[PDB]
């Protein structure tokens, strides 16, 4: 969160290293949610100033692109070294930049900006707040943003009252394909869409309360 000029534009908010180009501090995480602003994406056009702790396999300080949401997303490669990377088109509209950091580093960091215009050849919004609120699977067929038998990306948005904390408990939980975290799951992101704040992700028979 000490990452700097990340503040986005119409596309490509220039997504640089923390305290660029002075030096990035020890242990950091910053997730850099590439919005890939609609009808366009971002191509990571890295600047000349690029050096982050070269090591074997980049098990130390490194950088990722991870086309896809997180996790199972195919990495191009690790990106540690002194030469500036290239070859990014990043056709996904939902992206991420993992910049890990060890305790004993050097090497000020990175900076890159948008280069993708064209078009590839859901809006299940649930804005609500208050003391409580019951988000159900009943509305996802009743709010009419979905169709029976198609891929959904419907995300519930929870806003707290000011000066409060959130406690999700499960009053009902039932999966049609148990222990199969590929086709049906419920994940809990604590903030923005980042794996930095992902408390639990359930696809088994029982979902514990977070």
């Amino acid at each position: 969160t000490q990452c700097g000029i990340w503040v986005r534009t119409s596309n490509g908010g220039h997504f640089a290293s923390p305290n660029y180009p002075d030096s990035y501090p020890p242990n950091k995480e910053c997730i850099y949610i590439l919005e890939a602003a609609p009808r366009q994406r971002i191509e990571l056009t890295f600047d000349e100033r690029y050096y982050i702790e070269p090591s074997f396999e980049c098990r130390f300080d490194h950088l990722e692109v991870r086309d896809g949401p997180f996790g199972f997303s195919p990495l191009i490669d690790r990106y540690c070294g002194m030469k500036s990377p290239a070859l990014i088109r990043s056709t996904g509209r939902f992206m991420w930049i993992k910049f890990s950091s060890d305790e004993e580093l050097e090497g000020l960091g990175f900076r890159a900006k948008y280069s993708f215009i064209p078009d590839p050849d859901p809006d299940c919004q649930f804005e609500l707040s208050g003391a409580d609120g019951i988000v159900r699977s009943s509305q996802v067929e009743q709010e009419e943003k979905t169709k029976p038998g198609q891929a959904v990306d419907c995300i519930w948005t929870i806003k707290a009252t000011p000066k409060a904390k959130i406690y999700l408990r499960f009053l009902d939980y039932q999966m049609e394909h148990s222990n199969e975290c590929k086709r049906n799951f419920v994940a809990v992101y604590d903030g923005s869409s980042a794996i930095e704040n992902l408390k639990a992700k359930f696809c088994s028979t029982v979902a514990n309360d977070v």
Binding site: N179, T205, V206
Partner: protein, 422 residues
């Protein structure tokens, strides 16, 4: 043009015939003079001399005796003590220095006028390290003969710091080829995977004593660092069930290469027979194959440069030669398909770091090619497991035993948990 003269510094064999590198230097000058299509209106002349291979003062006199008489290139004394003394003469006078033998380049020399046609051990030590990971080894027992063989294999000693190996470096006795006290301690340690960094005159001498002891069996593997592994008498070891994996840069699957080697042994009528040597025949060893390629790569450079007049430079009044800086740029940028394959030099160094090896290994029909190393590619060791005789044992054992099983409580039900299971 005319005469253009090459220089030479070779072994003074006092009793026997001329050296194997010195025949191959005269055989390569006579080949280019007779076959007209290389250097058509240009002939070659040699000015070979004799040294004692260790006195750097003698190699420095015979260099300045050729520089005063006038040569175009020095073709290497081929020893680490005396090649370094002639390398610095060739730098301060301008004339190139072509050398067909490995030499420790001290990391702070500013020598520019040399190329080395021997395959550089910074590239070769990756090739052995690709083999010791292809056979899925965990313990190796690298054995060298002289102290410089730790420089030849330093990319292999530095392997357990990054990979999963266990180096157990040993050293052969001084000259004294009875290495049975060394091989006896390798039996007690259960040291079955061995790497020899020794020449083929000594690699054919350890195997007489690995056979006199119980070490040529089906348990012992042997990787040899030498490139003259094909020139070993392997008839006593062919049926033992051993493995003897190695490399061979000498391109002996080409008709043009094998015909010159048949013309080589015709010119080796002065061959001394040795039944106790453990070596097959007067094959063109790879130290004499590179001298044949040394003349041709320079012959590519004189073909692209018909302006070259040999001067008569001194050493007490040394001057850079008028055409030295351009003619050296042609040698480092010349390609050739020699007997050792593709010759190309590294622009930073002048060292062959890009070359094609053939992974040969010992089977019951002799030494057979089973792969191919390349620096850009890696191991292309195909080996396919198709072309083998019969009688392999296979167990089907489909003990999956697919059970059809519905869920119905209390009998079958999913385990209650928060993590995913499978």
């Amino acid at each position: 043009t005319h005469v253009l003269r090459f220089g030479g510094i070779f072994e003074y064999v006092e009793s026997g015939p001329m050296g194997a590198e010195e025949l191959a230097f005269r055989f390569a000058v006579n080949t280019i003079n007779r076959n007209r299509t290389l250097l058509p209106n240009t002939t070659l002349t040699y000015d070979t001399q004799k040294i004692n291979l260790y006195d750097s003062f003698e190699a420095s006199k015979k260099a300045c005796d050729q520089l005063s008489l006038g040569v175009a290139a020095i073709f290497g004394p081929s020893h680490s003590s005396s090649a370094n003394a002639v390398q610095s003469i060739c730098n301060a006078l301008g004339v190139p220095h072509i050398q067909t033998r490995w030499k420790h380049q001290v990391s702070d020399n500013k020598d520019s006028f040399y190329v080395s046609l021997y395959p550089d051990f910074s590239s070769l030590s990756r090739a052995i390290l690709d083999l010791v990971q292809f056979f899925k080894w965990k313990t190796v027992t690298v054995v060298y003969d002289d102290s410089t063989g730790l420089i030849r294999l330093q990319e292999l000693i530095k392997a357990p710091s990054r990979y999963n190996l266990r180096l157990k470096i040993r050293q052969l006795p001084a000259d004294t080829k009875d290495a049975k006290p060394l091989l006896k301690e390798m039996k007690r340690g259960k040291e079955f995977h061995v790497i020899f960094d020794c020449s083929h005159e000594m690699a054919a001498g350890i195997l007489k004593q690995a056979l006199a002891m119980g070490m040529m069996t089906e348990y012992y593997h042997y990787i040899f660092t030498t490139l003259d592994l094909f020139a070993l008498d392997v008839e006593p070891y062919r049926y033992s069930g051993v493995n003897m994996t190695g490399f061979r840069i000498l391109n002996t699957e080409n008709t043009q290469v094998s015909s010159i080697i048949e013309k080589w042994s015709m010119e080796r009528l002065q061959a001394p027979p040795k039944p106790d040597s453990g070596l097959l025949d007067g094959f063109m060893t790879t130290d004499a194959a590179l001298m044949y390629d040394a003349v041709h790569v320079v012959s590519v450079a004189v073909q692209q440069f018909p302006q070259m007049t040999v001067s008569s430079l001194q050493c007490n009044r040394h001057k850079p030669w008028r055409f030295g800086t351009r003619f050296m740029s042609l040698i480092k940028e010349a390609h050739w398909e020699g007997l050792t394959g593709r010759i190309t030099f590294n622009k930073t160094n002048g060292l062959r770091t890009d070359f094609d090896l053939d992974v040969i290994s010992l089977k019951e029909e002799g030494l057979e090619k089973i792969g191919t190393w390349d620096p850009a590619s890696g191991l292309n060791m195909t080996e396919s497991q198709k072309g083998k005789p019969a009688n392999i044992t296979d167990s089907l054992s489909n003990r999956s035993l697919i059970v059809t099983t519905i869920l119905e409580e209390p009998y079958v039900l999913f385990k209650k948990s928060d993590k995913p299971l499978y």
